Design a protein around this ligand. Structure first.
Ligand SMILES: NC(=O)c1ccc[n+]([C@@H]2O[C@H](COP(=O)([O-])OP(=O)(O)OC[C@H]3O[C@@H](n4cnc5c(N)ncnc54)[C@H](OP(=O)(O)O)[C@@H]3O)[C@@H](O)[C@H]2O)c1
Length: 315
């Protein structure tokens, strides 16, 4: 019976974090732009929301608004963040917004641990990285490479994380980070987020081809579960990579064609001339060591399409 804060509580990954929290007798203070906007309707109907959900009005760049939500809480889950390649609304709002939380939780005075939601964008983005090496928590991105290629979401997450590590040390608050990859799964929120858009663009004919690239995948519930496990585990420390497996673009559109042949999923590749990129080795032992059984991607991709259809996003 403790109290915790979750920023951007009505987000894709966040909405699942609240459900799990509310189900274990946690009081959840959910920061949103407007507690009475319809966007948050899907939070007031959870088993424990009426009793222990409290929607706090707060922008992420409003220091005082954060302190109001963070105050009285034993833990904080900073999930809110911009998700875009526009650096003007990504980079500084992420570092300032993140530093506000650490300070606010450090400001006063019950918080034993903060959990920041970083990204894989601050891990695997380094072309100097070898093909043989296992991508683990000690892997960081080349910030110059991100800047040269306009990868500002990956940039912002890297800086926002390192800023959180600094801010945490400077103020002496317990921090532990979770690095989810491209997340996918059932949507609780009524709107389509950025990661689902990468999945949905195959199923609505937005794409007639798929790129010659690779990427890691994880279920949204595996993420929400990770944040909760890394928080409750006392000895939990450092970063925590959160992924199930690495797939090629081809392997993805195959799984979707497999279970959904009535949709116009791509079959042809954008390259077809250079050798297809092979998936990279990675480690998710830190989360597994905490007793986390990852849901298969294929199983998670299915619940997504079934969810999107039920909610009108797909015919
Ligand atoms: N989903 C993934 O695949 C993935 C992978 C790696 C890391 N992450 C990170 O996980 C966290 C949540 O991701 P997500 O999938 O849940 O994305 P999301 O649902 O689309 O956005 C999360 C929430 O953050 C809010 N937000 C952003 N800027 C804000 C601001 N200045 N003030 C108040 N609220 C703000 C958003 O509100 P608005 O919609 O109104 O802007 C949204 O409700 C993020 O840090 C994300 O970068 C996600």
């Amino acid at each position: 019976g403790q109290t915790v804060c979750v920023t951007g509580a009505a987000g894709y990954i966040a909405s699942w974090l609240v459900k799990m929290l509310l189900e274990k007798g946690y009081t959840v203070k959910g920061t949103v732009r407007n507690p009475d906007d319809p966007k948050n309707a899907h939070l007031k109907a959870l088993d424990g929301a009426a009793e222990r959900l409290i929607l706090c009005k707060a922008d992420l760049l409003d220091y005082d608004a954060i302190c109001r939500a963070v105050q009285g809480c034993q833990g904080v889950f900073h999930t809110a963040s911009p998700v875009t390649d526009d650096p003007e609304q990504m980079v500084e709002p992420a570092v300032r917004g993140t530093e506000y939380v650490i300070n606010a939780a450090a400001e006063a005075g019950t918080v034993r641990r903060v959990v920041f939601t970083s990204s894989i964008g601050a891990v695997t983005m380094d072309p100097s990285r070898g093909p043989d090496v296992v991508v683990d928590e000690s892997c960081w991105s080349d910030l110059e490479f991100c800047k040269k290629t306009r990868n500002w979401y990956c940039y912002g997450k890297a800086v926002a994380e390192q800023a959180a590590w600094d801010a945490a040390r400077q103020r002496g608050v317990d921090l532990v980070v979770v690095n989810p990859v491209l997340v996918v799964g059932p949507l609780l929120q009524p709107t389509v987020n950025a990661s689902i858009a990468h999945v949905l663009k195959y199923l609505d004919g937005s794409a007639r081809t798929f790129a010659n690239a690779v990427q890691a995948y994880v279920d949204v519930r595996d993420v929400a579960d990770a944040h909760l496990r890394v928080f409750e585990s006392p000895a939990a420390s450092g970063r925590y990579l959160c992924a199930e497996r690495v797939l090629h673009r081809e392997d993805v559109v195959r799984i979707l064609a497999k279970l959904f042949p009535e949709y116009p999923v791509p079959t042809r590749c954008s390259d077809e001339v250079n050798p297809r990129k092979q998936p990279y080795k990675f480690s998710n032992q830190k989360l597994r060591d905490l007793g986390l059984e990852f849901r298969p991607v294929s199983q998670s991709l299915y619940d997504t399409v079934k969810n999107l259809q039920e909610k009108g996003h797909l015919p």
